[PDB]
Design a protein around this ligand. Structure first.
Ligand SMILES: O=C(Nc1cc(Nc2c(Cl)cnc3c2OCO3)ccn1)C1CC1
Length: 301
């Protein structure tokens, strides 16, 4: 019989995401992470399996996919996605728990940017990889590895591009992701969803917000900010699209960039990146590749 889900033993509930539930399990004694969906969540499970099985997707900054599988407990069927397990868990949890050095902040930012640039990059060839946009990037969907680098997870809302015929592989709906991190053009439904570049540009805005979350926790001489989500100072917990739109589109506010960040070159570079991710017009935003190059150069300095 089956060689994956059949031989994995669940040990601990991690939490619920948008769809399904995440567990820590053991496969041949090795820790793995398992996202479990019910029968009525088959479409979400299949789509996420489909994205993870994209040719040439594997990358140190994308969550390591092990397998999609079914498991029948004798009463109902569970739909499984099995991945690498990372003890730290999400970047959200990590940044709540800890402060980071300049070096640590750069490692988190660069690795996140490298993951995104890999998603975004079309790789030509017989085993070519289509460009992929995530559509729900946030600190809760990025995991921190033991080596202090990040990998991106939760690929179920992603869209894939066919460059040749110029088509996206699904018919995407407006506003599928996390409201707090929606780009201005997503918030007001102005985004042109026939244009794949628009989804890439929306991801960059969200990454900018994640970079802000990280930079806050960069402690220099004991001085740092408390952990906050972007827009903590302007919208309620669990904000509505209208609440978000009023702040982001009408008032045109972005997360505050503290004065203390100009006094350190690494923070200065990060703050400049954030601004250039946060333009209301997506076409003006930096690319993931450019951001990766800037952070790579910085980590060398
Ligand atoms: O939570 C922890 N680790 C952890 C959590 C993961 N979450 C996810 C996410 Cl976010 C999305 N898709 C998944 C996941 O697992 C399978 O598919 C993955 C790996 N490791 C440690 C704090 C206990």
């Amino acid at each position: 019989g089956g060689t994956i889900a059949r031989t994995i033993v669940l040990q601990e509930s991690i939490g619920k995401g948008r769809f399904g539930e995440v567990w820590r399990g053991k496969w041949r004694g090795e820790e793995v992470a398992v996202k479990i969906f019910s029968s009525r969540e088959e479409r979400s499970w299949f789509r996420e399996a489909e994205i993870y099985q994209t040719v040439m997707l594997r990358h140190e900054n994308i969550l390591g996919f092990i397998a999609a599988d079914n498991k029948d407990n004798g009463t109902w069927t569970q739909l499984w996605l099995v991945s690498d397990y990372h003890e730290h868990g999400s970047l959200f949890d990590y940044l709540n728990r800890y402060t980071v050095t300049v070096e640590g902040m750069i490692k988190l930012a660069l690795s996140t940017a490298s993951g995104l640039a890999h998603l975004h990059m079309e790789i030509v060839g017989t085993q070519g990889k289509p460009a992929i946009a995530h559509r729900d990037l946030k600190s809760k969907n990025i995991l921190v590895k033991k080596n202090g680098t990040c990998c991106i997870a939760d690929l179920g809302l992603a869209v894939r591009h066919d460059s040749a015929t110029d088509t996206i592989d699904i018919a995407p709906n407006h506003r599928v992701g996390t409201k707090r991190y929606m780009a201005p053009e997503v918030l007001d439904d102005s985004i042109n969803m026939k244009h794949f570049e628009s989804f890439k540009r929306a991801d960059i805005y969200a990454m900018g917000l994640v970079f802000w979350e990280i930079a806050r926790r960069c402690s220099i001489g004991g001085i740092h900010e408390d952990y906050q989500l972007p827009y903590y100072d302007l919208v309620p917990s669990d904000p509505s699209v209208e609440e978000m739109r009023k702040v982001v589109c009408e008032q045109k506010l972005r997360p505050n960039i503290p004065n203390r960040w100009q006094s350190c070159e690494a923070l200065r570079v990060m703050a400049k990146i954030m601004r250039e991710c946060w333009y209301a017009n997506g076409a003006a935003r930096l690319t993931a590749l450019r951001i990766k190059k800037t952070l790579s150069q910085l980590s060398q300095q």
